[model samples]
Target: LPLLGMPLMLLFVQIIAIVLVMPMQAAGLVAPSSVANPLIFIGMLLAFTLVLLVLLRTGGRRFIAAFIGFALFMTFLYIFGALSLLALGPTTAAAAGTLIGAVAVTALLYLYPEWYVIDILGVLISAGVASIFGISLEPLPVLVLLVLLAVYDAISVYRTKHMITLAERGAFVMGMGDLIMPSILVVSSHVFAVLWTLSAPTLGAMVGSLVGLAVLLYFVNKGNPQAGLPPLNGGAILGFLVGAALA
Candidate 1:
């Protein structure tokens, strides 16, 4: 089973995001403003991608890879600490524990990247990003983000085909973004303001995304480089709105 854990991995990412929403907010990671938020987020990614491509083109690819790997290592350090604060305590645990745990997990990654390790890392990283976005983005913005990104993905795959090559090289960083974006809506339906929505739309989005994942996998097996986000995001948005209407 190459991706036997894929479904559970996705499920855990959203669940972890849901649980971390409050703590991440308390940690002061909310988007600056809902109106400006998604724009800022998207812009940052675009600029980063531009810069990264320039670096890779200019022969700084090795340095760039190290830079990104180091950044990921640092992120998990904080994530480790922030998550530890839940069970442990302020000075009692978080800092040192996070450092040690972060080092251990990353070391294990560099040492032996078994399926479990990759899946767990995927879950943790996606959850952290998703939770922060979940706390920050409103349902409407999330919907808009999903729709717009899907179109962008479609263009990149069917027309431009940039992301497909990136995915082949594992430079497809936005895969996590695809997961986080829709999960934010599900999380927002619960965390943002009211509690009229849960399990119904939340599960709807989750389940729909899973169905989309199944389709996405089917395409992946067919040996064509395809955008994975459209089906997943589309299914999620419709499921979300359906639950919204139901509620």
Candidate 2:
């Protein structure tokens, strides 16, 4: 039951990201679909990961944590900022409230990153980030991005081992990227491939990601380090295609 909760949390994040699709589009926050999008995303991810790797090895522990916190702060700002804009429109009042809200959440996260606190904020952060990407990139680019990430994840976990080290010390049930990556398809499916109120492709992607999570957890319980994203992204893409066919 406890392990099951991880999959449930994954489900929750995907659902929230799906819900955010409309607002993100309405706010005109979607990214222009371009062939360069996936490459840019991967470049940024690789650069960040390299930076984190250096910081981790050089004993810049506090700085690394601060860096992560700062990143979270910015992400929270965007999440709350966009939502507030939707609620209150583009005004100084919304802007001011967004800043205060982002600060409050980030401050709380730093002050007390208990498991429960991290889980609560992590879900919000993942969904918000996922929604942004989902709305930004069309399905093709997202698919390309997912496949590329899956390969990178496999190499990072099994060959380089830096990502494993990253997760080992950070100590969370799932990496933020792990949650955010697969849900990109979920939200994208809902936004772009609607067959109903819930969207068949969206639901299929969600279910498939859950299946991937279950398999990942099973291997994790067997006590070997495993790459999370390959299975997750794979299942989501496969499920999405199947659902599209059905639709």
Candidate 3:
């Protein structure tokens, strides 16, 4: 019972992480078109991944190094971006607060590794990414990107399943974290303006994510390491499209 329960608990934890993270990601995507830089976005992602690989290869403690690096990078990125837009205006107070908060959260993860710590960081990262993308992409291009990613996610997960295996063998949390990061890009692009008050598409994506988790957990518990993002991604995209039409 104890052994069985642990995995279940982790599954629940992961689900909660997803839910907490998605909205903030959606919110972050609310940027101006002139400032949106796809090259920068892609470059940051590659740089982060490369740093992770270097750390892993150099025999750094896998979880600790990765987590610390990711937390620091993400926190800094968030603060810098916010400040750049004068979003942290008039003083250093907001930026200082953000730095302190991010450090505290990261330190807590090292000592605690509690479910809430992970979930909170997840939300922070999601919101940060969403805001950046939201300010960057126009609605139509964002819509196209979401559709393409949905199709790609489906193909990668359902047809290949190789990518799914890679995710499992790789850092599961990190991979999920990355996936959660990108989807918010889609949400942010499509729904940043209304995100402050919880728009229909945003709500739909949340509910759809829960449904996706249900499916994912069912298969995973049955000894099948299935792809999580395909259903989750698909559901969110569908919900977003529907919400867009309605909105």
**Pairs with backbone N, CA or C atoms under 3 Å apart (clashes), candidate 1:** 156-161
Candidate closer to the true structure by TM-score (higher is better), 2 or 3? 2
Question: After superposing candidate 2, which stretches have Cα over 4 Å from the reference?
Answer: 26-32, 51-68, 88-95, 160-174
Lowest lDDT 10-residue stretch of candidate 1: 190-199
Prediction 1 TM-score vs. true: 0.83
The TM-score, computed over Cα atoms with residue i paired to residue i, of candidate 2 is 0.83
RMSD of each: 3.8, 4.0, 7.0
Identify the runs in model 3 with alpha carbons over 4 angstroms from their true place.
1-48, 58-67, 70-95, 150-172, 178-198, 222-225
lDDT of 3 by residue, 131-242 (tens): 4454456544554544555565557666676645665435645544444533453445344555534566655555555555556667777886665456555666566666
The alpha-carbon deviation from the true structure for residue 170 of candidate 3, after best TM-score superposition, in angstroms, is 4.5
Best by lDDT: 2
At residue 138, give the lDDT of candidate 1.
72
Segments in model 1 whose C-alpha atoms lie over 4 Å from true places: 1-4, 57-62, 161-174, 193-199, 221-227
TM-score of 3: 0.59
- TM-score of each candidate structure, all chains considered together: 0.83, 0.83, 0.59
